[PDB]
Amino acid sequence: RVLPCFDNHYNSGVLVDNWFDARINEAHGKFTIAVDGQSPLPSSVYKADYSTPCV
Amino acid sequence: REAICIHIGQAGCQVGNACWELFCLEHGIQPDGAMPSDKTIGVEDDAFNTFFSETGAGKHVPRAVFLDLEPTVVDEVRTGTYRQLFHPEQLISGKEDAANNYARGHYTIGKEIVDLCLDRIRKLADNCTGLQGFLVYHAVGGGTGSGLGALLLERLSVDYGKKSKLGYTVYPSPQVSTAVVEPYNSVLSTHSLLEHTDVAAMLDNEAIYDLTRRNLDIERPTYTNLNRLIGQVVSSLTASLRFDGALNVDLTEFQTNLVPYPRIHFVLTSYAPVISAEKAYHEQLSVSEISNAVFEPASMMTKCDPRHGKYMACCLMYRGDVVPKDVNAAVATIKTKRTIQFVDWSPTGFKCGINYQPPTVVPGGDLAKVQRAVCMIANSTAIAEVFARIDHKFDLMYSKRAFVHWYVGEGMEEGEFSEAREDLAALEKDYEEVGAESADMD
Amino acid sequence: REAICIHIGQAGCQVGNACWELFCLEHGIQPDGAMPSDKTIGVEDDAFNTFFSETGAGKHVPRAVFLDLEPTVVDEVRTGTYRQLFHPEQLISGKEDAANNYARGHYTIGKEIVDLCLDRIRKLADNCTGLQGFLVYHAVGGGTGSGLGALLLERLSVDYGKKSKLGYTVYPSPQVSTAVVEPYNSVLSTHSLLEHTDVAAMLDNEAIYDLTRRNLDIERPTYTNLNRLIGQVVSSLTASLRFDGALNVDLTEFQTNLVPYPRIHFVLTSYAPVISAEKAYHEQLSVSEISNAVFEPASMMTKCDPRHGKYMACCLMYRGDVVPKDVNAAVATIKTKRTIQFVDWSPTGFKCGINYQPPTVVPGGDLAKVQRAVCMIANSTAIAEVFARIDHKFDLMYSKRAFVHWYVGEGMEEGEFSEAREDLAALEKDYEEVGAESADMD
Amino acid sequence: ARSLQDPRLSFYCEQYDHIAHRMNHYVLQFYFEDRTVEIREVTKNRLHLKRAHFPHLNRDDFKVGSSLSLLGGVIKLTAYADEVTRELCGERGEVTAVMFGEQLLPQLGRCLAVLTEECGFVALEMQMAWLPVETAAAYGVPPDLVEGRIVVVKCANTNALQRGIDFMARMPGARAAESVEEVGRWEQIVEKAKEQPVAILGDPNSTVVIIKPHALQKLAGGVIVQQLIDAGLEISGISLTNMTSQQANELLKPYKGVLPDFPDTMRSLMGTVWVLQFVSLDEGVDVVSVAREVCGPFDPVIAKELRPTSIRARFGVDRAHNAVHCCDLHEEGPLYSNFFFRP
Amino acid sequence: FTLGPLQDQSLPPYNDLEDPYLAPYWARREMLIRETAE
Amino acid sequence: REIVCVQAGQCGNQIGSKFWEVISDEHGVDPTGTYQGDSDLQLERINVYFDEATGGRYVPRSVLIDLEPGTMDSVRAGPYGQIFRPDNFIFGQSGAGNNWAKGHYTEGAELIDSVLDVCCKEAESCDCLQGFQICHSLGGGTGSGMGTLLISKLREQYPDRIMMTFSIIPSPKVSDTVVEPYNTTLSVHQLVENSDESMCIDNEALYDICFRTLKLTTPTFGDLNHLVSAVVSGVTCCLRFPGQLNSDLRKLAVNLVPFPRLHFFMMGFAPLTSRGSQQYRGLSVPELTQQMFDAKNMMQAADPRHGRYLTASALFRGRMSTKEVDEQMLNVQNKNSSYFIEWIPNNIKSSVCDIPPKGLKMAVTFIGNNTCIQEMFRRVGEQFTLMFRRKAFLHWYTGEGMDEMEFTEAESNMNDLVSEYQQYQDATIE
């Protein structure tokens, strides 16, 4: 496990070093663990399975 | 007539949910405890009474207790769909778990909760007129199931005495495993369980996973499937009390027929028409085919191979459309087989039961609908292999006192390890001695 | 079922762009990787699976790696139109080229990059359940294609073992030429390809230029035309895996039917209805006419004349609206011809395949739309003439050590030249010996 | 050819399994350029029927809400599976509903004739409904048609509403829906009537007649109905049901050993058929004798030679396809009515 | 340290003859036969 | 079952701000404190981390302690800072000076009583109290000295509960302070006696996570503290949501700790993947299991391949099958059997919880007890012995009042901890 040790003078747009990751990061923005948003939480297994049986 | 069910800890409560779902749907009691207005008319009937009691306004309430030390599972039952079915007093919950320590359940924490349990069981037993046993569901791998189950069975055995206690027990699977300390808890549980149980039925999740892969077509099973299978087994065994049949079987007959000597009370269980809905309509399912099915070890719900031992007694329960002549022809064919062997001191090896009610179909279930089924519980020397691997794992861990400081700190003498290990050694020798051929005495 | 594509160097990546364009257009996958919104019905079919895998959100991603030592071509792929199709991990690029030195690729630079490539291929092969071979695209005239292609084939052959390796290879044309040092790289490359490939397909740029001038009406062709023709050939050969048909042909069947002896694995390729839209409406295109066409030297994609040799085996793939009786009548007519000759030890000279999917038309393309096509791969002794001319150019240059100091400076012993030249001499003698009649040898 | 990108129509379909008592859902694909069909399972993405040629299908048959016969089973098309089939199959599938009143039953045959073979409406739903006053008011029948039997027809054609208004203007007595909600309520009416139809049960003086599908494809059902009514019979009962091979076998079991072309006759009853029940208000008229005299001999050539004015001499093509099936005994009336109308 | 391919991630069947934790059991039986004879 | 959190020093307060942001987000609590969630499953365990104030509001059960108020003014100025109870901020008037002895003996004993009053006030309000959770750095000044002082007092006052710590320890390469070995050694000496469970994190491992796995171009301390807050909030998930196989901190300790000194653990969290790649690979139990044991995703510089696992625990969140978990843990144990201590028959505990973290279908957090942790302590002890032989900066500590015998005791205790781990590494059945 090593750390990067290169100084990148240029900006993203010049094909040197990490241009792809730089473009993606400037496209999206801040860093969060969550991937999607505004989705309801699923119910528990007991609630999903043991519902009211059909008559 | 009546039977009382005792559910302990997580496995026992979750299996209880599937059992009571099934018993409701088979009798026809709604989740709110009533029955439809058109189901009251007809002939005057009571068969539910083994499991339900009526107040007189027509609500049904069940003869069960649910016991846990952590709230979460009981709070889930309390907040679920069956809220109105159970009496709130019936759902008993402590504050904090036994943390996989048998010692914590038995000495420190269960002693406070045990008197409430005994008062509830007393309140149930006063409202009966033909109680014919206790049914107990628990797992021996966890702390509260082992410790409080043992303590409660000891107290019940002193207060009620001779009344029978039949256990359904989930033992640690031979290579699937869930916790590190399983050998200690299973050994210490089994030491108490030896004195205070009449028949113990052993289950392993690895076998029910194998059965659900081979017969059903389920790639990714979960505990609700296993618990529904267990519920079907319990319904098959208790059907003999509840419905008409040619050859009935009272709960005392299992204990009388299956146990030859008072320590030799551990039995193997299997169930025949485990089949999917798409497969079921291409094949007939005659008596002889399912009878042949119950003897292959791929059909068993416990991970043991009976070809490495000898059977001492078998009890075969048939429910549905079966005729006695076919049962006799099937049993005679089984007896002819060379891979099925009985100990020479048990010449008359079989007990039969025949009930007319076919198995019920559950709306979310995965089993097909079928006209007949057979369920077997049997006593065999192969079970000795199950104890030997747990005892070896105990010896491996105990050689370095790997975890003992938890048990000694939470209140247990170090001597108790050696006592239990010596008792299990004697049980192994009992199964060795009983299996010795009586021939060639001269 | 599955196949993995490995693209090496400049020609192999550029031919890969045309191949994946075609496979997308044949299945209906959009360049972003998803099926069209007006064509998603809810359920679909597995035919893509040979070349694409789905994540679960319904995006498609292809089973390919692109390997180069110079960045420019892979950076063109990263910035091009298909940016979203490929996984970014699959596109591997070094810092600096192998400068037309096989020695530089094999010894100096490829040794650093090869282990990342092997890790990527391993990660692909773990996400498969019926991998049935590797397809490799490279040119032997350049430095990185020869050196890294050899090194990678050696490592693949050790790690994966029995799995098949099928090569499509662009060899140096007999009078069109692009670099001075081409003979040296091609001899040393061919030494490695002899040991570590199951079938090798030979291509010459001069033949595809002649075919595009004569049959198509293109005065000034460029590499995109050649790459589209190669893509059509690969689609024809792999169609037997992907669509329904009367007579399928699995990739293991090619090696059993085409290769008589383990060294005799170099094959010629041709394709019949390369035709323009204006000619196509003046002519019918029956089975027998295109079958007669594939045997004419005007149809081949390699510059060799089969009249100077004898055929050992032919594999004929028909796709589109063809009926087996017409294939049989055509093959029976071919056998009668006097200018087509088979070795007397190969009486049953033909293998047939018949698939229902007609060849695809590419929006910018120059081929007409046609109801049927046939593609042929065949093993013939005429190929020995191709090696002899490269060997003559090698002998001319090596007599004066014209460029050798570069190769010795980049790490190679002078001895390696003589070894490779002797191996190609032995391959020429094998093709001389195999073609000798038994009637003269008695 | 057999290309994978060839044009097609896609639907979701249903088919009842009489063995497992379970409903199954599929996805049907029809390549109209060469008349081939493929069926796939929705639940587990499993192939059900490989791409095979069927010569008796046509592009006009595939409409939403319709039913088809495939290898002796009935399959129901109620969906659109993609946008392309919505574009192609639209503009010719608008749904309108037409109701008929008591005073115009004696001319019902000409009503169906003008409905089908001249106004261009092709329709598969047709039932007779009797409703109480409160339910009739709730569903929205016209007030003047209350207290009487009504025949509701679910038609389908291009520009359904305007053509229905034109049909209203052309022949008096009929009523048609003027809005989408009226269409929906009348569809509810026809479904509720399907749950429990109206007919006379247990009457020994009754007769049931079935019209074969090949007669309907020639747009001759209305003329047949009118010719039956003209002979002196009063219509009581109408239906449009699809019957499977097992139902045809159960209906035609007594004929096993009489007809010389039994399996071919069994196949001729697969598809959409009309069911007619006739009674007489005069006790001196025997319905079976007059019905059989009008229908004629079951062999079309003999019918053409001897009884040139008969129905089978008018619309038959062969012994298996004789365009009508009618009761032949004096006791079969109650049995046929019980089979075709008891829920 | 490799997890292996995906197709070999399944449950191995149980074979008590090759279970490493039951060898003393089989040794005990093999001794028990001669012990019974004596 | 209520947890009380303590955040001490700059690192602790900064990590705490992100932790309480993550916890407030999962339960839908606005930075004003109002509940705005959308399912009852969120409300039914809100008590575990929040106390309820009147007319809607919730307050977080945390004590903030520091010797200079600069950090506290920064956290109060942050976006969620208002949620914290004003009376819970305790601060002095002069800094720790990066000196352990000042933090432990002079300003420590001056402030510590007011912290104990606040901690007791918070503890006695719970209907049933679960363990404490503490975040601090060991390399600092007030974090190490006053944190370990408070830990010792709470262990005196509540010896039957659980004591859990999350702790930042100096990188061997990236030192921020010259006197790190003294403060680290004295703090580890205090922790090994007082603590029940201790988690260790290297900033180098978070940088390598960001650069290699997430490919971030310009990471900041906010990202490192978000990764830490994610793992910290994951361990408690089974305490506060339903599941098929519930688990608890005490049950984790019982399965993880074979012997009472062996309570130092490695941490990991599995679903890490860059924004460009995420479109290319769906979540599944094999992918999480493969990442979970990859040393790239493990948060310390020592590598597992140089040691052996005594025990491990995995907590799964999401709707998933138990069979796949059991068979994955069996397969990893069988194929890599040399890396697992052989005298324990099964080293992995599993647990399953129904409710995943927001915006992920499934997640797992990994806790590992591995002997390779001995390498960190050995490095700290070498640097300590180099500094101590020459009395390199000792006059500061002696001027505050420490006796030299403490340094030799702390060195001996750390050396014995390293020896005990080394002995269990090389143990055999015989």
Ligand SMILES: Nc1nc2c(ncn2[C@@H]2O[C@H](COP(=O)(O)OP(=O)(O)OP(=O)(O)O)[C@@H](O)[C@H]2O)c(=O)[nH]1
């Ligand atoms: N078949 C089956 N097994 C279960 C179920 N629930 C838990 N188990 C198993 O039983 C064992 C765990 O025992 P638990 O019931 O969780 O232990 P406990 O009674 O809660 O004891 P404590 O943890 O101290 O509270 C494991 O082997 C689980 O796989 C279940 O619903 N069905």
Ligand SMILES: Nc1nc2c(ncn2[C@@H]2O[C@H](COP(=O)(O)OP(=O)(O)OP(=O)(O)O)[C@@H](O)[C@H]2O)c(=O)[nH]1
């Ligand atoms: N048909 C075809 N031939 C090509 C193409 N690109 C290059 N060639 C031919 O292949 C030979 C050159 O090989 P290259 O691919 O350029 O060599 P390389 O793999 O880039 O090796 P390096 O120069 O060391 O990077 C010449 O004969 C070219 O005419 C192409 O796109 N299509």
Ligand SMILES: Nc1nc2c(ncn2[C@@H]2O[C@H](COP(=O)(O)OP(=O)(O)O)[C@@H](O)[C@H]2O)c(=O)[nH]1
């Ligand atoms: N991961 C992380 N480390 C931090 C943060 N703030 C400070 N540190 C580290 O902690 C150490 C400084 O300790 P500090 O908190 O100032 O000690 P104190 O003076 O006693 O409060 C240095 O190694 C810093 O790099 C943070 O927000 N996140």
Ligand SMILES: [Mg+2]
């Ligand atoms: Mg529990």
Ligand SMILES: [Mg+2]
């Ligand atoms: Mg190049």
